[PDB]
Amino acid sequence: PHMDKNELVQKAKLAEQAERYDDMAACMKSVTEQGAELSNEERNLLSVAYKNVVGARRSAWRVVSSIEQKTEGAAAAQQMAREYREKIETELRDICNDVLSLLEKFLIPNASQAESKVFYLKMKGDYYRYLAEVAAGDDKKGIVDQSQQAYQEAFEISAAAMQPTHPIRLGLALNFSVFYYEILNSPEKACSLAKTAFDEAIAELDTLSEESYKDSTLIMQLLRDNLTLWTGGGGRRRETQV
Amino acid sequence: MDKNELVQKAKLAEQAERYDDMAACMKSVTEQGAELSNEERNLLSVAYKNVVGARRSAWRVVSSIEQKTEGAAAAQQMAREYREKIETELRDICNDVLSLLEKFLIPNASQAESKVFYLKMKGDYYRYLAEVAAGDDKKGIVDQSQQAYQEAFEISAAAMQPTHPIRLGLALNFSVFYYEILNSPEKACSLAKTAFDEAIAELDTLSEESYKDSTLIMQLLRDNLTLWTGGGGRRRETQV
Ligand SMILES: C=CC(C)(C)OC[C@H]1O[C@H](O[C@@H]2C3=C([C@H](C)COC(C)=O)C[C@H](O)[C@]3(C)/C=C3/[C@@H](COC)CC[C@H]3[C@@H](C)[C@H]2O)[C@H](O)[C@@H](OC(C)=O)[C@@H]1O
Ligand SMILES: C=CC(C)(C)OC[C@H]1O[C@H](O[C@@H]2C3=C([C@H](C)COC(C)=O)C[C@H](O)[C@]3(C)/C=C3/[C@@H](COC)CC[C@H]3[C@@H](C)[C@H]2O)[C@H](O)[C@@H](OC(C)=O)[C@@H]1O
């Protein structure tokens, strides 16, 4: 029925504890469709739910894609893997389009604060990036442009209105960096973006609050994990403190 | 879709951890009516193990939340109704498996090892029904599980080696059935200890490269024995 948003959130937390993320996503989708601005808690429940729904397809897509490449010497096995991948892609695009619709219809146009604006624009960039991961041929370029345009708009807002220690500004830099490295095949810009975001958070560490401490320090390590991974083939100088 | 294509897509779904797809593929193979190979048999069981295991895990999480929700009638009802929703999915899965066992797998089982596999499976999925049963229907569900386990137990005791992973796995689950469903811990321990002792008497067989599965089940059997027997004056163990 048309239930209260607190009732739906309660059901979403029940589904989250049971690791039933379809249910959790359906509850938070209904919360979004009521048209009221999401609280930080509801926003995070929505994001986590669809993170898990789409992630199951992305991990399965990579497994099947790898098998398709490993079986390229046999036509029957390769075609079976290809057709299974195409089924998974259809599920993947339907999920991404579902999230992208909720962003366009409810979340982005109703975002009244820069923090939430950046959150939803980063989400838009992420789910277009997930579409880019499985886009083939000539239709990839348009999807990549959509991802970049949302990331860059979120980056402009974030650079002007958010501290470098804010988890959303850090998470934006992390994923935008991955976009440059893996979608645009631009490792220099990807490393520059990751290194700058980390360094700026370190430089202004005194702006980090307790409520953002665990999230921000986690994402700062994710930034360094990627930099260390990418600045391989020589380099990755160890760090001291004197 | 031909038989061999279905099995190949089932293996594909297994690697992708898409167990609903895997179960659907092996159910279609089963419904073709021919006897399953040992590989196809294992694919079918692993598929439905994961499909039903997700509901059982979620059932226990939601049941616990529901039981801990005192003085919040609305929240407790919401938790119960969500558990009941999970229960319905769980029953449909078990009924699906039990129907496949009764219509195809058990009647077509040509040799003892297969008969024991499928009869153990029938005992297992009736046991899963018993875990969420109550009222009047539980007694009948429990009897169905015990009768399937018992026949598998008599066939395996007759025609299978004590080191066979199917016979060991039967002893593991039948003993748990006794401990947990029938509240017969001494029967449960004796069943588990006899199977463990009879297999450890052929320890050289268990060390062979082909007996990794029996080796795993032997760890579980002894784990339950340690859990159920002793555990009072035990001191922690080290190894220099
Ligand atoms: C019940 C609510 C749940 C679903 C658990 O919230 C998830 C998490 O929600 C918050 O954390 C957010 C957040 C995450 C944190 C980095 C988790 O950090 C930990 C474990 O310490 C991961 C999540 O996916 C989430 C919600 C998302 C993002 C992501 C948003 O892009 C659009 C990039 C930034 C990051 C932000 C929003 C984090 O603030 C919280 O601050 C976290 O609490 C902790 C651990 O401090 C909580 O684990
Ligand atoms: C990887 C998965 C696939 C390919 C589907 O096979 C699952 C597994 O299938 C076989 O193992 C069976 C088997 C299991 C073994 C205990 C797994 O052992 C190891 C070392 O991983 C667990 C499975 O669920 C399965 C198929 C089921 C049963 C169970 C059936 O009850 C009705 C009773 C005991 C056990 C038997 C049938 C085992 O022989 C094999 O012997 C295993 O191979 C090894 C190396 O142990 C393989 O991992």
Numbering used by the authors:
A (entry chain B): -1 to 240
B (entry chain A): 1 to 240
Manuscript excerpt for this entry:
14-3-3 proteins have a highly conserved dimeric all-helical structure. Here we study the structural basis and druggability of 14-3-3 binding to E6 oncoproteins of four tumorigenic HPV types by a combination of crystallography, binding assays, and mutagenesis.
The addition of FSC consistently decreased by 1.5- to 2-fold the affinities of all eight interactions (ΔΔGav = –1.3 ± 0.5 and –1.8 ± 0.4 kJ/mol for ζ and γ, respectively) without altering the apparent preferences of the different peptides. Next, we used a soaking approach to crystallize the ternary 14-3-3ζ/18E6 PBM/FSC complex and solved its structure at 1.85 Å resolution. Also, FSC binding reoriented the C-terminal carboxyl group and caused local destabilization of the very C-terminal residues of the phosphopeptide, increasing their temperature factors and dispersing the local electron density. As a result of FSC binding, the water network around the phospho-PBM C-terminus significantly changed. This indicated that the hrm-HPV E6/14-3-3 complexes are in principle druggable.
